Amino acid sequence: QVADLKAFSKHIYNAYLKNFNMTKKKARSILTGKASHTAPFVIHDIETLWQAEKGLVWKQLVNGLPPYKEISVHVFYRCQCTTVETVRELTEFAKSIPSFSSLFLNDQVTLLKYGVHEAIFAMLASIVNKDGLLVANGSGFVTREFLRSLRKPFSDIIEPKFEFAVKFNALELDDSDLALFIAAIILCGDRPGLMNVPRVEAIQDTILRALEFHLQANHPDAQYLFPKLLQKMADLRQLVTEHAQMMQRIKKTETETSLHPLLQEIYKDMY
Amino acid sequence: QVADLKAFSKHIYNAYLKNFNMTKKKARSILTGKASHTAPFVIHDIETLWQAEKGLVWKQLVNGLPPYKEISVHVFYRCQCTTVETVRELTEFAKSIPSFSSLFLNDQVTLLKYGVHEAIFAMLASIVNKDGLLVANGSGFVTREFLRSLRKPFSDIIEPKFEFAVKFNALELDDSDLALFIAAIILCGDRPGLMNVPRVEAIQDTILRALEFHLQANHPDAQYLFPKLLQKMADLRQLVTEHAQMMQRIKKTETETSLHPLLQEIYKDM
Ligand SMILES: CC/C=C\C/C=C\C/C=C\C/C=C\C/C=C\CCCC(=O)O
Numbered sequence: 001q002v003a004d005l006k007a008f009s010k011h012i013y014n015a016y017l018k019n020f021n022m023t024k025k026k027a028r029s030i031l032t033g034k035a036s037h038t039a040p041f042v043i044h045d046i047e048t049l050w051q052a053e054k055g056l057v058w059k060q061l062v063n064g065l066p067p068y069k070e071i072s073v074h075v076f077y078r079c080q081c082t083t084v085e086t087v088r089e090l091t092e093f094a095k096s097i098p099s100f101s102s103l104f105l106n107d108q109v110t111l112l113k114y115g116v117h118e119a120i121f122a123m124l125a126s127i128v129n130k131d132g133l134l135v136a137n138g139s140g141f142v143t144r145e146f147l148r149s150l151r152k153p154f155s156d157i158i159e160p161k162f163e164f165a166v167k168f169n170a171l172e173l174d175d176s177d178l179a180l181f182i183a184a185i186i187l188c189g190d191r192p193g194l195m196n197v198p199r200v201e202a203i204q205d206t207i208l209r210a211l212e213f214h215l216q217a218n219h220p221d222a223q224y225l226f227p228k229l230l231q232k233m234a235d236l237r238q239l240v241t242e243h244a245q246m247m248q249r250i251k252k253t254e255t256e257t258s259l260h261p262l263l264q265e266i267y268k269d270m271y
Numbered sequence: 272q273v274a275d276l277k278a279f280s281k282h283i284y285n286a287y288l289k290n291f292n293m294t295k296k297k298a299r300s301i302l303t304g305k306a307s308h309t310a311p312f313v314i315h316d317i318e319t320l321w322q323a324e325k326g327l328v329w330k331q332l333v334n335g336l337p338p339y340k341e342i343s344v345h346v347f348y349r350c351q352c353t354t355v356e357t358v359r360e361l362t363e364f365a366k367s368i369p370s371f372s373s374l375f376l377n378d379q380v381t382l383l384k385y386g387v388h389e390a391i392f393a394m395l396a397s398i399v400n401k402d403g404l405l406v407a408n409g410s411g412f413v414t415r416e417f418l419r420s421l422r423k424p425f426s427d428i429i430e431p432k433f434e435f436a437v438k439f440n441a442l443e444l445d446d447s448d449l450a451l452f453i454a455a456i457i458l459c460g461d462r463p464g465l466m467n468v469p470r471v472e473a474i475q476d477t478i479l480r481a482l483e484f485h486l487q488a489n490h491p492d493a494q495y496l497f498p499k500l501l502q503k504m505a506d507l508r509q510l511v512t513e514h515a516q517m518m519q520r521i522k523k524t525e526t527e528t529s530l531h532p533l534l535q536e537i538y539k540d541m
């Protein structure tokens with residue numbers, strides 16, 4: 001409808017504002033180039049990465065790439081630590097969504113388990129750039145070249161994402177739309193082992209209808225509006241599948257590196 | 272021909288559906304409970320009014336308030352803007368009535384001139400509620416409480432309209448009834464300066480005749496509806512009289528506020 005479908009798209013927008021510290025616009029700010037309000041320390045190589053591990057600080061001792069842990073793996077650990085944290089915000093974010101907490105715990109776990117990476121890779125575009133990614137809560141900025149200059153096993157696990165972030169930022173969405181887009185991916189009725197599918201499917205529908213109208217009063221000048229955004233959701237589904245594939249293999253050949261137990265829980269039923 | 276009269280009535284009903292941007296049906300559906308609700312943006316204070324102007328919006332008239340135009344006057348401005356727009360629709364409505372378009376334009380104008388406000392108040396009831404009314408295609412809803420909190424002048428030209436609307440809605444009329452009713456108040460033979468009254472009187476007769484026959488096959492189980500509507504017309508003729516007197520007062524007293532050129536024309540000899 002209107003107000004009800006207005007106070008719905010807004011409640012999910014505030015939930016999105018108080019659960020995610022870095023917002024697309026708060027981040028599109030830094031990457032800008034005219035506003036020196038925040039000049040992100042660029043990396044691009046081992047040296048600056050080493051100092052950054054001080055000038056940007058990080059709870060893991062000054063760097064640390066011993067014979068048991070190398071550079072590329074350190075980026076990996078860095079990356080999975082962030083992911084584990086984004087999973088936390090996504091959990092709190094969803095718990096704020098209208099009929100989400102209504103579902104039984106097990107069903108909430110099933111939705112997060114299968115949608116947290118899709119939402120993550122979507123938010124990733126908000127802090128990304130054609131030439132790099134914004135890290136360390138806006139304070140830092142690692143170049144895309146550096147990441148491509150990583151070992152053979154890893155490296156090609158972050159590239160495909162940039163490809164996504166690029167195209168996805170062409171649509172020019174803002175945090176208000178993004179909030180509705182994320183709620184929609186988390187509340188997906190196609191997740192395996194879901195118990196009350198009819199319920200989820202129903203909550204998803206209004207999310208999408210809310211998104212639908214919201215794009216009408218926000219982006220009146222294209223056609224991507226919904227179909228293209230619905231196709232991205234499908235694109236994202238594949239990005240994750242491919243992502244999960246690379247994760248298992250890494251775990252199978254990179255015995256050296258450790259995988260966080262939570263990401264292991266998420267990965268073990270995705271084929 | 273008692274028959275083939277329900278046809279002339281359906282044509283009038285088509286003229287009503289094609290020309291008015293808001294019908295009672297679409298209106299009564301907005302003020303619904305919750306089942307497939309809509310819930311219009313509410314305006315009940317200066318804040319929400321400001322939020323409306325920016326959100327629900329309208330267009331031009333967003334003039335300040337302390338200077339040569341204030342809050343109450345801003346509502347008055349939006350009031351006459353909705354009034355000038357309803358007049359345009361009423362003109363098209365009438366022109367979609369062959370019998371009406373037969374007459375000479377000068378006569379047509381005299382009819383639109385002395386009947387447009389009466390029709391505007393009958394219809395007002397369709398978008399009105401016991402507590403407020405819809406605005407901007409039903410997108411908004413202004414409370415009755417707010418309106419009555421305006422400066423004494425503007426506030427009391429609004430109240431009487433509600434008193435009328437509430438009692439009018441008790442009759443429970445649908446759009447097809449209103450079409451006949453509104454056509455009746457416009458093709459009225461007693462209008463000042465009417466040139467060919469015998470012609471008008473006759474079209475009025477047919478409309479009221481079709482009106483009574485339509486109320487036959489739409490409101491079977493019902494009291495003295497037909498004549499009850501004839502007294503409403505009389506009541507409408509009086510409400511417009513006191514409205515014109517109140518408009519008179521604002522023209523002499525609220526010199527700072529401006530009136531639309533078309534509306535001054537309707538009140539010139541009125
Ligand atoms: C508040 C931060 C919000 C949104 C930004 C989203 C994501 C940043 C985190 C990771 C992105 C970097 C690389 C992605 C590629 C591989 C990581 C796999 C992580 C994992 O083990 O689950």
Ligand SMILES: CC/C=C\C/C=C\C/C=C\C/C=C\C/C=C\CCCC(=O)O
Binds near residue numbers: 350357391
């Ligand atoms: C939207 C038009 C369709 C259906 C309803 C019909 C008419 C209601 C329109 C305007 C009435 C609103 C406020 C009237 C109160 C004061 C202004 C009187 C102005 C005047 O004398 O011409």
